[PDB]
């Protein structure tokens, strides 16, 4: 089951939080103004810790590592020269990161470092503007808690919207209509984007609120308890925007939940915009709009990669040891070739690795070769590395 022991008790850590983004001068995480919560961890590791031992960071009830982009992940942790001290892995089910020590701890004593993570609240729990949340985490078995105020800037206005989250393939975009509950007729909403497109009305769901309690400040409403419109009038426009015709809504409030597609080979800054045109409570045409922007951080949207290959005598070479190394030569994983001569490593974060084939005594490869180790460079980007063996 485990590569080593839980060594929480042998990792001595100090933790602090730092608010980033537009709310920092107001002591708040401004969730729609680049706000996030940075977690900073300084640690030392006992000399008795070995390769495969691990410590954990439990992110508690209220926050997760990462911000707006799914799936959430943690990073490996390195020393001052980029050598990997521990491999980071995150389990969404338990909201816990595991940091598994490499052979760094067997090479060096007085192992110490620091790392940081960006984090965001679960929008279904941190629901309300100005909510002061006791953000309690556990770092190497020791609790750390600080109250943190979150604010999404929901305003009681004709139209406001926010990006709930983003994945490689789509964003969930939330638009609130007529929170001010004014009498409105001829109501229409255009959803448009830079970096996004609609292809089907199936991408858009419309809900009528029973009362203002359903307009959750976090823009991640409880859809299970909202009244969903069966026959919503939705057109996908030739430019890839969509128009939702709500009609003569009177004083009713509406929520539109949309899932615009990301565009392949777009980067920089995505934008999703809600444009609300209507006739107002005085029979005058009006127009209101709101826009949200989001960075396509490819590294945070990418899936995990892997590679593999065959080893043979130049007949399959079964049970050959193959190590996965970081570019600095630290071992990240080990495996052996199976009965068909095949090995693999998967769930690898994009980047550069070395693959080390351990030579049986008396054999050399058919890249560099030293002290009976054949080492090949590999680049992972969400391929095949083979080795033929010949007598010396």
Features:
monomer, 392 residues, mainly beta, Immunoglobulin-like, 3 domains, seven-stranded mixed sheet, five-stranded antiparallel sheet, 2 helices, 32 strands, Uro-adherence factor A
- Number of helical segments? 2
Strands, count: 32
Strand content: over 45%
CATH top level class name of the largest domain: Mainly Beta
CATH topology of the largest domain: Immunoglobulin-like
Element layout with pairings:
Blueprint: E1 11-20, E2 29-30, E3 36-45, E4 54-58, E5 63-65, E6 77-78, E7 84-91, E8 96-101, H1 104-107, E9 112-121, E10 131-139, E11 142-151, E12 159-166, E13 171-177, E14 185-194, E15 196-197, E16 204-208, E17 227-228, E18 233-236, E19 242-247, E20 254-258, E21 261-262, E22 269-279, E23 285-295, H2 298-301, E24 305-313, E25 321-325, E26 331-336, E27 342-348, E28 351-358, E29 363-365, E30 368-370, E31 373-380, E32 387-391
Parallel strand pairs: 2-11, 24-32
Antiparallel strand pairs: 1-3, 3-9, 4-8, 4-10, 5-9, 6-7, 7-8, 10-11, 12-13, 13-20, 14-19, 14-22, 15-21, 16-17, 16-20, 18-19, 22-23, 24-27, 25-26, 25-28, 28-31, 29-32, 30-31
PDB class: cell adhesion
Keywords: DEv-IgG fold, Cell wall, Hemagglutinin, Peptidoglycan-anchor, Secreted, Virulence, cell adhesion
Assembly: monomeric
């Amino acid at each position: 089951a485990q590569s080593g022991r839980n060594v929480n008790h042998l990792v001595f850590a100090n933790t602090s939080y730092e608010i980033l983004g537009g709310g920092k001068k107001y002591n708040q995480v401004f969730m729609t103004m680049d706000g996030k919560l940075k977690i900073k961890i300084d640690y030392t590791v006992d000399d008795s810790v070995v390769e495969g031992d691990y410590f954990t960071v439990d992110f508690g009830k209220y926050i997760h590592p990462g911000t707006s982009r799914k799936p959430y992940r943690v990073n490996n942790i390195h020393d001052a020269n980029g050598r990997t001290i521990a491999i980071g892995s995150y389990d969404s089910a338990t909201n816990t990161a595991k940091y598994t020590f490499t052979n760094y701890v067997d090479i060096y004593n007085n192992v110490r470092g620091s790392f940081s993570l960006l984090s965001w609240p679960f929008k279904e729990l941190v629901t309300t503007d100005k909510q002061s949340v006791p953000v309690g985490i556990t770092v190497a078995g020791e609790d750390y808690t600080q109250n943190v105020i979150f604010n999404y800037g929901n305003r009681t206005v004709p139209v406001i919207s926010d990006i709930n989250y983003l994945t490689k393939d789509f964003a969930e975009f939330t638009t609130y209509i007529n929170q001010n509950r004014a009498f409105n007729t001829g109501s229409k909403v255009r959803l448009s984007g830079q970096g996004f497109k609609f292809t089907s009305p199936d991408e858009i769901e419309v809900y009528k609120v029973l009362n203002n309690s359903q307009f959750r400040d976090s823009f991640s409403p409880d859809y299970a308890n909202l009244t969903q419109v069966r026959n919503p009038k939705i057109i996908i426009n030739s430019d890839g925007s969509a128009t939702v015709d709500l009609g003569d809504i009177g004083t009713l409030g509406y929520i539109i939940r949309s899932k615009p597609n990301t565009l392949p080979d777009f980067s920089g800054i995505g934008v999703l915009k809600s444009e609300y045109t209507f006739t107002n409570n005085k029979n005058q045409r009006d127009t209101r709009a709101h826009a949200s922007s989001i960075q396509f951080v490819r590294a945070e949207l990418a899936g995990f990669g892997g590679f593999g290959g065959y080893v043979w005598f130049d007949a399959a070479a079964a049970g050959i040891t193959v190590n996965l190394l970081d570019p600095t030569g630290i071992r990240l994983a080990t495996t052996t070739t199976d009965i068909t001569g095949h090995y693999n490593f998967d769930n690898l974060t994009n980047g550069n690795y070395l693959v080390e084939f351990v030579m049986p005594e008396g054999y050399i490869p058919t890249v560099v070769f030293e002290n009976g180790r054949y080492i090949a460079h590999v680049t992972i980007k969400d391929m095949t590395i083979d080795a033929g063996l010949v007598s010396d």
